[PDB]
């Protein structure tokens, strides 16, 4: 049971990866290459009002 | 057998260590349990401060740490006496007391 | 011939037969069967007839 199942990652690297994922989510080619069927979405950084 | 350059290592694994290995898979559960106990205690003493009694200002002992200052165990009886608080009423009103602490200065 | 409780002795068997069949018994011989049951041969008094006593018991 003491296989060392868990890994610790640097906080700065985890924040770096979050920033990279967010930046990639705003590019239509990458979101399309994830196969997300965005061909009629009006604007890729899709923002809606707070009423949602 | 040593192999070229290296550090002379002394592992302390000659004493059947695998019978006594403490895993930590209950660490998140322990943290959750401690948090629930803290919240239950804070609810139980409803207007009283959640952390507990006030602690005295206390200088750290040795020459490494005497520049720092921290929280002690309880206010000394001399401090209570000159502050005009009874040593049996202080703990009722939430003042931690320490009868064995002295005041050198 | 009866199959009786294994803990019942000859006196108890005699009194039980006397009470719940209203017959007088001459003697009781007792064995324990190989299957563990106890078997009692109860010989009745000469004035009591085993044949019609067995009839009124219902084992003819």
């Amino acid at each position: 049971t003491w296989r060392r199942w868990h890994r610790r990652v640097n906080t700065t690297q985890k924040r770096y990866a979050i920033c990279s994922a967010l930046a990639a989510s705003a590019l239509p080619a990458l979101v399309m290459s994830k196969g997300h069927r965005i061909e009629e979405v009006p604007e890729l950084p899709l923002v809606v009002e707070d009423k949602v | 057998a040593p192999s070229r350059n290296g550090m002379v290592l002394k592992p302390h694994f000659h004493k059947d260590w695998q019978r006594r290995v403490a895993t930590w898979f209950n660490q998140p559960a322990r943290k959750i349990r401690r948090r629930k106990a803290r919240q239950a205690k804070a609810r139980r003493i409803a207007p009283r401060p959640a952390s507990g009694p006030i602690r005295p200002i206390v200088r750290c002992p040795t020459v490494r740490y005497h520049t720092k200052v921290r929280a002690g165990r309880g206010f000394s009886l001399e401090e209570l006496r000159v502050a005009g608080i009874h040593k049996k009423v202080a703990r009722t009103i939430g003042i931690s007391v320490d009868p064995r602490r002295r005041n050198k200065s | 011939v009866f199959i009786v409780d294994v803990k019942a002795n000859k006196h108890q068997i005699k009194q039980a037969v006397k009470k719940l069949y209203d017959i007088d018994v001459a003697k009781v011989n007792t064995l324990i069967r190989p299957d563990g049951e106890k078997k009692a041969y109860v010989r009745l008094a000469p004035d009591y007839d085993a044949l019609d006593v067995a009839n009124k018991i219902g084992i003819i």
């Binding site: - | - | 324990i32 069967r33 190989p34 299957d35 563990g36």
Partner: protein
């Protein structure tokens, strides 16, 4: 032997009573999974514990 104690005789009585085949109607029960008495003992093949 012919001379035996009551405890030994009772033990042999229970062994006799439980050394018998299964009833036929058992195999018609729902979800039986029992074909035969697999605890059958023969006096010459295997000997008793005592």
């Amino acid at each position: 032997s012919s001379h035996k104690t009551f405890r030994i005789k009772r033990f042999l009585a229970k062994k006799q009573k439980q050394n018998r085949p299964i009833p036929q109607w058992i195999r018609m029960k729902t979800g039986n999974k029992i074909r035969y008495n697999s605890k059958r003992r023969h006096w010459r093949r295997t000997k008793l514990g005592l």
